[PDB]
Structure 1
Amino acid sequence: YYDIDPYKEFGASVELLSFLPSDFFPSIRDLLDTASALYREALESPEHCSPHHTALRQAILCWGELMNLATWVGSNLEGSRELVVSYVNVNMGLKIRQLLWFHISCLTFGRETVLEYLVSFGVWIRTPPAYRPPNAPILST
C-alpha cells in the first residue's frame, strides 16, 4: 500500500516523535496498568469524547491479537517459543508503546502541553553533551 500518519490529526508527525530515544518509553506492562488504573471507567461508558479513547481501544485490541498469536505459535508449531516473542516487541512492540505514551500523556497533562515538551526534548538531545545540561527537561503541570 502506501504511507499514513496517525498523529497528523492530533498535531504531530511520526518522525517528530522519532527524536525520543528507543529506551525512553516505559514498559508496556506499566502503560497498560496506568491505562487501567484511572481510565477503566471511562472506556466502559463511552460518550462523545476525544479519539484518544478509541485509539487506546484499538491499540489494546491489536496488541492482545499479538499475545494470542504468540501463545498460538508457542503452542503448536516448531527459537520456537521466544524468537517470535523477542522479535515482535523490538521492531513493532515499540509502536504500541509510542501510541499509549502519547495518548495517556495527552489526556492527563493536556493537549498542547505535550508539544512544547517534545520540541524542548529535541533541542536538548541534538546539542553535544559538552554543552547541554546533565538533566533532561522532564515534564509536569
Structure 2
Amino acid sequence: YYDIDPYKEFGASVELLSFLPSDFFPSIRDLLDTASALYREALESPEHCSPHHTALRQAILCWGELMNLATWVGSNLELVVSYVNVNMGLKIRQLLWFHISCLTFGRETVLEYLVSFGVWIRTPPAYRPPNAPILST
C-alpha cells in the first residue's frame, strides 16, 4: 500500500543507484562471505555504533527468513527458484553492496565513484577509456 526510499536517509535515491547496470553487481554468496568475514563481531556487537550496521542486520535477517521461506516452499511445492532468486537478487545485491562498500571509504567517495561510472557508461563505446571501475583507498 506504501512505498519508501531505502536509500534516502543516507542521501541516495533509487534512480541514482539503479543507474548502474544490473550485471555489474556480483553474486550473493561471496557478498555474504565477505560481510561475515569482515564483521562477524561488529554486526553481533551489543552496541549499535552506526546506522549502517543496524540496517544491514535487519537486511541479513530478512534474507535468512526469506531463504527459510524458500526452503519451506520447496518442501511444500505440491523453475520455482529461477524466477524468484533473480527478483530478490536485483534488490538484495544492491542493498548489501551499498552498505558494506559505504562502510569503508567514508560513504561519500562511493557517490563520486558511482557518478563517474554513470558518466563513463553514458558515453558510447566509439571512444571510451579502458579503466572505468572503482579505485582502492
SS of aligned partner of 2:26: coil
Shift of the alpha carbon at 1:2? Answer: 2.8
Indicate conservation of the 8 Å contact 2:26/2:93, yes or no: yes
Offset of residue 23 of structure 1: 1.0
Structure 2 length-normalised TM = 0.92
Structure 1 contact 70–84 (Cα < 8 Å) conserved: no
RMSD over equivalenced CA pairs, Å: 1.7
Q: Secondary structure at the match of 2:74?
A: helix
In 2, Cα distance between the equivalents of 1:9 and 1:46?
A: 23
Matches within 5 A, 1:95-114: 95-114=91-110
Deviations 1:15-56 (A, max 9, x none): 101111111111100110011101011111132422111111
Deviation at 1:76, TM superposition (A): 2.2
Contact 2:20 2:118 in 1 (8 A): yes
Q: Identity over the aligned pairs, expressed in percent?
A: 100
Show CA shifts across 1:59-95 (max 9, x none): 1111112211111111123xxxx92211122122221
Give the Cα–Cα distance (whole angstroms) in 2 for the partners of residues 51 and 29 of structure 1: 23
Give yes or no for contact 2:7–2:13 (8 Å, CA) kept in 1.
yes
- Unpaired runs of 5+ residues, structure 2, are none
Judge which range, 7-16 or 82-91, deviates more: 82-91
The answer as to whether partners of 1:35 and 1:104 remain within 8 angstroms in 2 is: yes
State the SS of the aligned residue for 2:133: coil
Point out where structure 1 has 5 or more consecutive residues left out of the alignment.
Answer: none
Please, which of 110, 122, 126 is the counterpart of residue 122 of structure 2? 126
**How many Å apart are 1:138 and its aligned residue?**
2.2
Q: Which runs of 4 or more aligned residues in structure 1 lie more than 2 Å from their structure 2 counterparts after TM superposition?
A: none
| Residue 131 of structure 1: how far off its partner (Å) | 1.9
How far apart, CA to CA, are the structure 2 residues paired with 1:3 and 1:139? 34
Counterpart secondary structure, 1:121: helix
Cα contact 1:7–1:13 (8 A) shared by 2: yes
Alignment check: 8 A CA contact 1:120 1:137 kept: no
Structure 2: distance between partners of 1:51 and 1:105 = 14
